[PDB]
């Protein structure tokens, strides 16, 4: 037993399990009612609906509501989504012990401690029916999964089976016209206290406090004020079917059947919760949890967990399996047993499930294993780890125990374990708790064989006969020898391709998919360890790593195919579909699409024309179509998507033709881009394009520098003026030098107020007159000879080239 | 009603009731719930109906209140019009004989930048054109400016209405009370008028004139406002070497550190700075002005030095002030730090002079000897001062008191070769009363090195050699030491040769000499006897023996760089060390895209189903430290809809109460039980939530000490250095590689990174990545690195441990 949930609330008189969802309601003696998401751990609601004890609690899930009954003497209906009181109704004139909801119309049943249980119709003004019989308290009313009948447990020493659509109960003799009830000695003795009798049941244990059913059985068990539990047939009122379970020490508050085990779980107002044998009907074992007394019990009609309410609070407790072994063939999931019986196949986003016949497991699973050709299933039965049990083989597409006993298919024989192994019809078995090999002599092997033995490892489960004592050991087909042992880190699972020759093992990042023995074919790219993923024999690997099913790869493409609304494990890939089942084991299926897959299959084979159609909004994203296609240094993909002003910018430098850059740079509304593309421009060779860019980034001085280098003199002058005003002394200043005469500087420098510098520059060119002007306007003294000349010839022949390097030739490829 | 968001039904009732008090209270209750930010439009017709025309100020004032904080939003009782229920009968309010209602009305009306009230606010200046108070005229200049701000930057607001429309600002200057709402964008004539007003000021008003127009030619002209600007203006006209002597800055400055010692400590700093600007060597840092309080005339009465003595501190004022003060003595006067540190140290270090400077705790005493002594090592002049003071330290003549003294002085002799010959005779004296290691160690070293100088040695050593105390470390120090210097230059009943005999016995041999040594078995395991035993080639003589070693100093020994030094005065250093200096089916497909630096989670939402999913809404959630920067906003997910919807993503937020998993993404649709479904887009980790932070070597070291990091793993793909994979990955688990903890050479040179983070997890995170990259013939495991990790309870330690391996995700839809 595992404790899923345990919240101390104080004395819970009523407890009920939601049939739709894995929720619990508790009604407390403190007058508070609480609705719990016991799996999620999130309080849904909490209401103080009455000062004193609220003894009865129910789900009213026909429309999303819960119903409570309290000692206010009322049955009240409550919203769990809007937290408001939907409707209020007069159940009775005393304590509402248990309440039950009709699924016919919004009718509500309340069982009370004033000896009647009544059903009331809100939708109309009518109280449709009152069901009477008790002479002392109806402690409990309980639904079967059909809505026609209910059972009530009362402390007048009976259990009364009622009809809710009926006036009290509904029955009529076909052998007589007279009423079924007799107040006289007939073939049984009872009073006149009913309209008619469909079924008056024993409840004698000095009154039964509660009654409840197994979800798939008409049988009911009742706990009563004494110290016994008595199991009843409510479908016949037999007294040759009723066995008494003895173990408890004081008044048993309830007893209900465990849906998922072959035991009956009871709880009593002593201090113990006792567990009972349901093939022997006496106490297997007693547990004390020391929360003292238990006044309520509950068994899940959604066959999830199990719960019992105590005087400290309640516990929902777990007797279920986690991470089961499974394999998918074409449309059949085969898995190892979990709650809610056998399920699987169909759906794709819903948490509903539905049945198909593909049970790999139909008996206690010692082993469940697929054939490597996927044609048989081996199920090993009668448990044990001694040296013998039974093993039953089933056919894989549709599974029975035996298909026919008169046909080779579906046979059984002895063997502690038998598990299939490669050569694709073979199996290896343990029948002495050694490794023995199994043949039948042609077809998938069903018959027990004793030759060949080993002295290492110990029988268990597998798919290649896994055995453990310190590692997971693969065993051979026809040899006693260990084929190989694997040791690695796991996430509690073993993943098969679908063929059970091969195995996938989980590692520190993702999963690795491997062949028979331990040989690693490839590694799935993905940062974290996947929960499960399976390969369609190889190639197309589909996996779950969250709430979505995505392909690790198909033909070098990468896609997330679709998301489901639940966390899940891939069951495996056999066919185009991928099939999944989770811990609770609800299915999702998903067709492998030609969405993400076609697009990149096409882009890889350099098709852009194909790819435009392929572009859809089921796969567009942001960067797999509209900006992933700007990721070629010799643009190809890049040419195709260029819609973003940034992608356009990028495209241009990758070609080296910046004509497009300037425009993208423009449409990026930014200077930085113009200077950087201008530099790239100078690199392709041509300075016209550089000028334009550099002019608008305002790098007139860079231009001034560039310009004799380029051999322009006309353009070089334009730069000088528009750098004059900036007082860029390594911009405006340059150009005068660069033309044969220096006069440009002389004026700019005059405006700077740098009269000295202006004179020196001018004077040397033999423009002593201008040099003198500067001296005269400002401080004179021009006579001085610095570490540089102040009057020696400056003349330079400017640019001998007739065509300039703004006109640098180009062809462009 | 402090904050009660559902109470709007009661407020409507309370708002009209025939009792004026109730109405006022109601309207008041509305105000307080809106201000907090809660529900308010239901009420509007009720609110508006009583109050509208009236001159009765309180309700009017209340309604006037509610029109500046929500008028636009509320529309039941107002709707949209030019003369709304905010102002239609508030033209009456503006034109009442009572100044208060008019004034109030004017004030809110003009305050709004509302365009549905633009016309009614314009002649609203009428209400305050007549100025019954200073408040009325100020209210007017602020309201005209607020009108100007509200779309009337042209002729609707600029001239006069009858006295103000943007002209109160002019009028105020010459009127009895000033206030200029004219700070920006307003009449030039008023700006000019404010200047005139500087003279004819009104003090509150002067702060308003002054924010607009500052700098005076004068000293002042009066009032705090002018005065406050004035110190700014003064700092301009003399920037040079701080303010030096703080101006009118002094008044605010004290409050800036009201907690309480820190003000004095700061004040002391400024006063020291101010005294003089010295040489400004190592801890001689006094700036400000060279002469302004001088230093050191011999005719100055009662001198500068009296204030200088405060700064020399033992703690003479309290600890915060102490740390500042010791640095400050050093700073005004020394040679560097050395001079004034020796004086200061002489006072602090242990003596027989004062017993208020000696203590029997050995480390502090020792440290104080080392601090005094480091000054000599720094600077020569100090050697001469230190040795006689050291002998006074010894004179205490407790076992331990001698001991500490002997230990440093012996180091000083290693530096200071045959200069401290004189000390030896003093040093022997207290060596006889003995209960500790330290005394034996040190004494044996002085007496040993110094042998030529003295001749006493059999007698001194021998009382101790046959005396007891604690003797582990004694062995090591005596072993290298006892023979040294001059081969036969002693004799009392054991010459220098007896000493070499002794020296050898004490090291690890055996010999009758000095009435046998105390112990022979050496100190910590590596040291042993043997090196020295081999040694003494030439019997205790300066050559290439113990003497050589003794009269030489290991490596460089200079300054206060901590090479035979300790770095200032021992008490000040503790504080400096402390200073760390830390700086409903649904289908999803998804990829993350970045265009023009916009980071977005691309999602495509797919309805593969024929079924209805209308009611479709899309939301991205805030989980914890993950947040939506804008959810996907399309109403998509309809019958056979493919859509691309973009959800923008952030990584940095504050924890929300909903789940803390990967990324939650929510699509809504038709269904009433699961109207909202959670389905996933691709991976985001728990690691995001960590917040990056950094450490320095001191913070790293402190944290190393603070909490354990023994935990290590070796991570593959740490083959590479710190910079490459390891930094990038460490970054993603919000970590950063900072400072080293390595020790590289030709045999050493693992790369070491000191990591830090301060996780939003109630822990920090730290680690050291050691990269085992071979720098030896026997590497650990070759290339790979072992990361030694922690976090504050090592719950994030583990994150560091595995997120430094690999990490990559991609898709290509």
UniProtKB/Swiss-Prot annotation, chain A:
GO terms for molecular function: hormone activity; mRNA binding; structural molecule activity. It is a peripheral membrane protein. The modification Phosphothreonine is found at residues 185, 591. It is found in: Cytoplasm; Golgi apparatus membrane; Cytoplasmic vesicle, COPI-coated vesicle membrane. GO terms for biological process: endoplasmic reticulum to Golgi vesicle-mediated transport; intracellular protein transport; pancreatic juice secretion; protein localization to axon; protein localization to cell leading edge. The modification Phosphoserine is found at residues 173, 402. GO terms for cellular component: axon; COPI vesicle coat; COPI-coated vesicle; cytoplasm; extracellular space; Golgi apparatus; Golgi membrane; growth cone. Keywords: Cytoplasm, Cytoplasmic vesicle, ER-Golgi transport, Golgi apparatus, Hormone, Membrane, Methylation, Phosphoprotein, Protein transport, Repeat, Secreted, Transport, WD repeat. WD repeats lie at residues 7-37, 49-79, 91-121, 133-163, 203-233, 247-277. Its main location: cytoplasm. Oligomeric complex that consists of at least the alpha, beta, beta', gamma, delta, epsilon and zeta subunits. Interacts with SCYL1. Interacts with JAGN1. Interacts with TMEM41B. Interacts with SVEP1. Probably interacts with PEX11A. The coatomer is a cytosolic protein complex that binds to dilysine motifs and reversibly associates with Golgi non-clathrin-coated vesicles, which further mediate biosynthetic protein transport from the ER, via the Golgi up to the trans Golgi network. Coatomer complex is required for budding from Golgi membranes, and is essential for the retrograde Golgi-to-ER transport of dilysine-tagged proteins. This is Coatomer subunit alpha. It comes from Mus musculus (Mouse). The chain holds residues 1 to 813 of 1224 of the full protein.
Swiss-Prot record, chain B:
Predominantly expressed in the upper one-third of the oxyntic mucosa and in most regions of the pyloric mucosa. Ubiquitously expressed including platelet, liver, heart, spleen, lung and kidney. It holds the Pfam family Coatomer_b_Cpla. This is Coatomer subunit beta. PANTHER family: COATOMER SUBUNIT BETA. The coatomer is a cytosolic protein complex that binds to dilysine motifs and reversibly associates with Golgi non-clathrin-coated vesicles, which further mediate biosynthetic protein transport from the ER, via the Golgi up to the trans Golgi network. Coatomer complex is required for budding from Golgi membranes, and is essential for the retrograde Golgi-to-ER transport of dilysine-tagged proteins. It is found in: Cytoplasm; Golgi apparatus membrane; Cytoplasmic vesicle, COPI-coated vesicle membrane; Cell membrane. HEAT repeats lie at residues 81-116, 117-153, 225-261, 262-299, 301-338, 381-418. InterPro entries: ARM-like, ARM-type_fold, Clathrin/coatomer_adapt-like_N, Coatomer_bsu_C, COPB1, COPB1_appendage_platform_dom. The gene is Copb1. Proteolytically cleaved between Ser-513 and Ser-514 by CAPN8. Its main location: cytoplasm. It is a peripheral membrane protein. The keyword Transit peptide does not apply. GO terms for biological process: intra-Golgi vesicle-mediated transport; intracellular protein transport. Brefeldin A induces dissociation from the Golgi of the beta-COP and presumably the other coatomer subunits. One of its GO terms (cellular component) is cytosol. GO terms for molecular function: structural molecule activity. Keywords: Acetylation, Cell membrane, Cytoplasm, Cytoplasmic vesicle, ER-Golgi transport, Golgi apparatus, Membrane, Protein transport, Repeat, Transport. The lineage of its organism: Eukaryota, Metazoa, Chordata, Craniata, Vertebrata. Oligomeric complex that consists of at least the alpha, beta, beta', gamma, delta, epsilon and zeta subunits. Interacts with CAPN8. Interacts with SCYL1 and PRKCE. Interacts with COPG1. Interacts with ARF1 (myristoylated); this interaction is required for binding of COPB1 to Golgi membranes. Interacts (via trunk domain) with ARF1 (via switch I region); the interaction is direct. Interacts with KCNK2 (via N-terminus); this interaction increases the channel-mediated whole cell currents and promotes plasma membrane expression of KCNK2. Interacts with STX17. Interacts with TMEM115. The keyword Acetylation applies. The modification N6-acetyllysine is found at residue 479.
